[PDB]
C-alpha cells in the first residue's frame, strides 16, 4: 500500500486541525502553525518522486501523485520545497485522502481552509504551488473513470 506514509486524513483530521487553528486571530501565529504542520509531512524519497507529477514553478517546486485502492478510495502523496506551501498542502491532503472520486468531485476541498480560517494564507501562496496541486488533484480525480 504505502511507504513513508502521512498522517493527514487518518490521524490528523478536520477536527484536529480545527482545534489548532480556530483560536488563532493574529496572522503571524497562523503562519507559524502552518509551518509546524508541514513538519509532519515526511520527506518523500526519490523513488516516490519518480511516480509523482513534478510541477516545477518559477517560485517553488511541488510534487503530487496518487494511487487508488480496490475500495475506490484514493491515496494522495506529495511534497513542497517551500515550508508555508508544505503546511497548506498538508491541509489539502486532510480534505482529500481516503475519499473516492465521486465524493471528491462533489465536495470542494477549499471549504476546509474557510473552516480553519486560512483563506488569506491560501490566497497569498496560490501561484507558489497551491493552484497547481489543486488542479493536479482534479486531473487525477478525472482519470478514475478509466479501467472501468
Amino acid at each position: 500500500p504505502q511507504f513513508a506514509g502521512h498522517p493527514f486524513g487518518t490521524t490528523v483530521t478536520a477536527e484536529t486541525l480545527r482545534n489548532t487553528f480556530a483560536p488563532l486571530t493574529q496572522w503571524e501565529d497562523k503562519y507559524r502553525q502552518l509551518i509546524m504542520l508541514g513538519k509532519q509531512l515526511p520527506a518523500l524519497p526519490d523513488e516516490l518522486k519518480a511516480q509523482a507529477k513534478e510541477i516545477a514553478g518559477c517560485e517553488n517546486r511541488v510534487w503530487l501523485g496518487y494511487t487508488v485502492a480496490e475500495n475506490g478510495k484514493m491515496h494522495f502523496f506529495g511534497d513542497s520545497e517551500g515550508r508555508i506551501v508544505r503546511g497548506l498542502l498538508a491541509v489539502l491532503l486532510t480534505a482529500v485522502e481516503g475519499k473516492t472520486a465521486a465524493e471528491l468531485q462533489a465536495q470542494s476541498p477549499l471549504a476546509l481552509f474557510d473552516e480553519l480560517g486560512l483563506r488569506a494564507q491560501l490566497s497569498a501562496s496560490r501561484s507558489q504551488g497551491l493552484n497547481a496541486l489543486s488542479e493536479a488533484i482534479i486531473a487525477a480525480t478525472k482519470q478514475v473513470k478509466h479501467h472501468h
Binding site: 503562519y31 509551518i35 517560485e59 520545497e81 517551500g82 515550508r83 508555508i84 497569498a124 507558489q128
Partner: protein, 401 residues
C-alpha cells in the same frame, strides 16, 4: 542637472505611495507622471488629420513620436537616428539579430560564444539558431570574481568563432564584465558582438561608438517607460546586411505575386502598425530622464544597496552574490527557502522578487536553484533599507527553527 536631489526625483512617481517599499525595479520600473500623462493623452485623442479643440496637445504627441529615435540615439551616443530600430523588447531585439544576421551566414561547425551569466533572452535564440544552422554554442565561464572571464576569451576563440553573445550587466549579480576588452578580442577574430543591455541601459547606458558595439538591445519598461516596446541598435552596415524580419506593410516598397522589394533600415525591420503608444511613452520617459545625471542617480542607488548588504550581513547565515557594489542585491539565508521569504516580506509591505530570474545556467554555476533579489532605484530611500532589514528579522524569526 546641477546636483541630484533624490526627493525631487521621488516626487514624480504617482505609484510610490501605494507601492510601499518597492525593491523590484530590475524586473520592471515604476513610471513618472510624464509617461502616464503622454499615454493618457495619446489614447484620449484622435490620430487623424482633424483636430477641432486640442491641436496643441496633438502637435506635442507628434513631436514626441518623431523625435523618439533621436532621443534613444542621444542616450547611446549613436551617430545617427536611423541606426535605431523599434521592437517589442530586448527578447525580440536579440531574436532578430540571430535570425536576420546570423542564420543566413552561419555554416555547419561555426561557433557562438555565450557567457554563462546571460539572461535566457541572450541564450535561447542562439541555441535555436545553432540547431537550425548546424552551428554550436560554446560557453564563456565566470572568473573568481563571478564575472564572465574575458581574459579567457582568446583561448575560447577558434577560427570557427563568429558571434559573441555577452551581457552588459547581469540581472542577478549586477556585475558588468570588461566589455571594452571583450569587444577588442572579438573584433580581432572577425566576430560580431551582441550586447544585452536590458539592465545596463538603465544604470550605465553604453556609449556605442566609444565601445564600438555591433548590436545593442534594451527594454522600455526597465527604463521607466511603457511595456511592449524595446530597442535594437545596430551599426548601419549591419542593419543593411540583415534580412527582413517580419513581412507585411510599411517594410515593403513594392509588392506583387511574383515578389517584393523592401525599404531600407530601420523600416525594413519594422513590419505592421507600430506600437505608437510605446514609442511615444518611451520618448516621454527619455525626455524626462535627460534632466538627471545618471552617474549621480546610480551612485545613490548603489549607496542604498551597500547599506542594505552591510546591515543584512550582520545576520548569520547570510550570503550575497552582488558584484562591483551594484544597485542589484541578490542574496539568500542558510536553511530558508526563498519563496517563503518573499511571501512574508510581501506581508510586511516589502515588494521583492524570488526565483531563477531567467538565468538557470548562472545559478547552477553559483550552486543554487534560486535566489531573492532586492533591486534599488533612485526613487528609493534609506527608510526603505531600514524597512527591508526590519522585515527580514521578523521573517527569519518565523522561519528559522
Amino acid at each position: 542637472m546641477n546636483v541630484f536631489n533624490p526627493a525631487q526625483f521621488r516626487a514624480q512617481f504617482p505609484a510610490l505611495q501605494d507601492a510601499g517599499v518597492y525593491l523590484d525595479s530590475a524586473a520592471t520600473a515604476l513610471k513618472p507622471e510624464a509617461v502616464v500623462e503622454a499615454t493618457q493623452q495619446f489614447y484620449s485623442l484622435s490620430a487623424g488629420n482633424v483636430h477641432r479643440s486640442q491641436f496643441a496637445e496633438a502637435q506635442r504627441l507628434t513631436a514626441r513620436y518623431e523625435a523618439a529615435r533621436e532621443k534613444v540615439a542621444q542616450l547611446l551616443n549613436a551617430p545617427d537616428d536611423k541606426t535605431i530600430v523599434w521592437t517589442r523588447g530586448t527578447t525580440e531585439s536579440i531574436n532578430m539579430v540571430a535570425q536576420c544576421y546570423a542564420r543566413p551566414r552561419l555554416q555547419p561547425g561555426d561557433e557562438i560564444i555565450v557567457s554563462v551569466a546571460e539572461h535566457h533572452a541572450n541564450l535561447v535564440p542562439w541555441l535555436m539558431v545553432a540547431q537550425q544552422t548546424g552551428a554550436k554554442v560554446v560557453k564563456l565561464p565566470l572568473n573568481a570574481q563571478r564575472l564572465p572571464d574575458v581574459d579567457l576569451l582568446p583561448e575560447l576563440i577558434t577560427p570557427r568563432s563568429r558571434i559573441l553573445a555577452l551581457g552588459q550587466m547581469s540581472n542577478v549579480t549586477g556585475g558588468c564584465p570588461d566589455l571594452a576588452r571583450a569587444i577588442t578580442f572579438a573584433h580581432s577574430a572577425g566576430m560580431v558582438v551582441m550586447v544585452d543591455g536590458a539592465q545596463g541601459a538603465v544604470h550605465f547606458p553604453a556609449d556605442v561608438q566609444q565601445l564600438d558595439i555591433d548590436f545593442y538591445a534594451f527594454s522600455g519598461h526597465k527604463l521607466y517607460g511603457p511595456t511592449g516596446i524595446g530597442v535594437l541598435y545596430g551599426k548601419s552596415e549591419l542593419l543593411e546586411a540583415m534580412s527582413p524580419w517580419l513581412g507585411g506593410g510599411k517594410m515593403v516598397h513594392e509588392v506583387s505575386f511574383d515578389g517584393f522589394t523592401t525599404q531600407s533600415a530601420p523600416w525594413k525591420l519594422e513590419a505592421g502598425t507600430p506600437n505608437v503608444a510605446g514609442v511615444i511613452g518611451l520618448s516621454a520617459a527619455l525626455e524626462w530622464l535627460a534632466d538627471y545625471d545618471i552617474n549621480q542617480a546610480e551612485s545613490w542607488s548603489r549607496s542604498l544597496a551597500t547599506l542594505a548588504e552591510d546591515a543584512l550581513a550582520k545576520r548569520p547565515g547570510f550570503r550575497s552574490f552582488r558584484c562591483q557594489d551594484s544597485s542589484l542585491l541578490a542574496f539568500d539565508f542558510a536553511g530558508v527557502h526563498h519563496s517563503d521569504m518573499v511571501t512574508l516580506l510581501a506581508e510586511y509591505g516589502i515588494a521583492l522578487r524570488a526565483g531563477q530570474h531567467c538565468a538557470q545556467p548562472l545559478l547552477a554555476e553559483l550552486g543554487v536553484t534560486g535566489t531573492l533579489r532586492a533591486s534599488f532605484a533612485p526613487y528609493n530611500t534609506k527608510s526603505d533599507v531600514d524597512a527591508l532589514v526590519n522585515a527580514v528579522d521578523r521573517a527569519l524569526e518565523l522561519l528559522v527553527d
